[PDB]
Amino acid sequence: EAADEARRAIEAALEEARAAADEARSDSTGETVKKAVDKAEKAAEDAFREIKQAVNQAEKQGASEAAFEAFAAIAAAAAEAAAAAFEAFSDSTGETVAEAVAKALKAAMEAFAEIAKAVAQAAKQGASEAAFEAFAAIAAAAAEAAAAAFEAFSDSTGETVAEAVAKALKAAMEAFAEIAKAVAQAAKQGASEAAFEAFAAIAAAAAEAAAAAFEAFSDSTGETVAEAVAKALKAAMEAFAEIAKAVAQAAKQGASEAAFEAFAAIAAAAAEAAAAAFEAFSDSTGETVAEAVAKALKAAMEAFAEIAKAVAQAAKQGASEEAFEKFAAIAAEAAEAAAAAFERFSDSTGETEAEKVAKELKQLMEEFAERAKSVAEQAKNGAS
């Protein structure tokens, strides 16, 4: 009766979303408003039908009852994210605003369906209940970021502002889907519960940086600033995705607990640096300063991905605990440097000073990645 309670809860979430689609629809009369709402309402339904199917695919493969409790936790977060893409819609009724609203709700829905299928894959691969708790945490983090993207949208109605908002919400969604897939691969590879705890922290660290970039967007509706915010959030998302994949490869290698701890600290160091580059953007609405900001965050999203790929290569070699600590200390030292290049830029918005501090953050990022790679190659030889 466990999968039965899951299907009924799944049908309570789909129903709670259609009512939310109706709750936003009674307060709208423009034709383009009802169009995109019917588009957004059809996107959460094809995702709701895809959730009951994964609840049935793990029934033929009779998963543990922890898989059905994560499917109900994922359906519930699905209903809340549609009601969030609709609560932000309630303050708007323009064509492009509703269009990007439908696009963003379709982005978190396709990401939600992909998470349930990954939960189903681990079910046939009979994972641990720590993977299920990480699945509910990854789904909860997904809802917190889509809702934050909508709240930031509640402050803006610009066509380009809403377009980059939908482009950004899809970026973390595609990043979140890739995280759930890696969680499924390690589930087939039956890794530890320290990996799933770091996976929950990685899902949270993603939400922190996404909400921060949106919080920075709550200060700017200039098309040049919105795209820079969107392209930046995409960089950190592509970074976090690579960090989740690396967290799975060492899980295939079956490493120690200190690795996932440094992986959870690396995801946090990424969040701190991403929010910092956004917090300095809260003091700059010039085009050239905005580009230098997002370009450095791209250089920082590349650096963090390298330091996570390096910590994984030492876990495959079976290294000591001093490596993951030095890896986490390089991640935080990188965060202090990317935050410093942002607060000092808050005292210079001339194009020359912006691209100058940016290029130095790329030179230092390549140096930090060189420092992380040096730490890895030293641990492979058996260093004391």
Residue numbers in the entry: 1 to 384
Which passages does the manuscript contain on this structure?
To test this hypothesis, we design helical repeat proteins (DHRs) displaying regularly spaced carboxylate arrays on their surfaces and find that both protein monomers and protein-Ca2+ supramolecular assemblies directly nucleate nano-calcite with non-natural {110} or {202} faces while vaterite, which forms first in the absence of the proteins, is bypassed. Here, we describe the design of DHR proteins that template growth of CaCO3 crystals.
Flat repeat helix-turn-helix-turn protein backbones were designed with either constrained monte-carlo fragment assembly with RosettaRemodel40, or by placing α-helices in a plane and then connecting them with additional secondary structural elements. In contrast, FD15 did not alter the crystallization pathway from that seen with the no protein and BSA controls. In contrast, in the presence of (j) FD15 or a BSA control (j) only vaterite is formed (k, l). We found that the spacing of the designed sidechain arrays with similar chemistry had a pronounced effect: FD15 with an array spacing of 0.9 nm did not template calcite, DHR49-Neg with a spacing of 1.0 nm templated calcite to some extent, and FD31 with a 1.1 nm spacing was a strong nucleator of calcite.
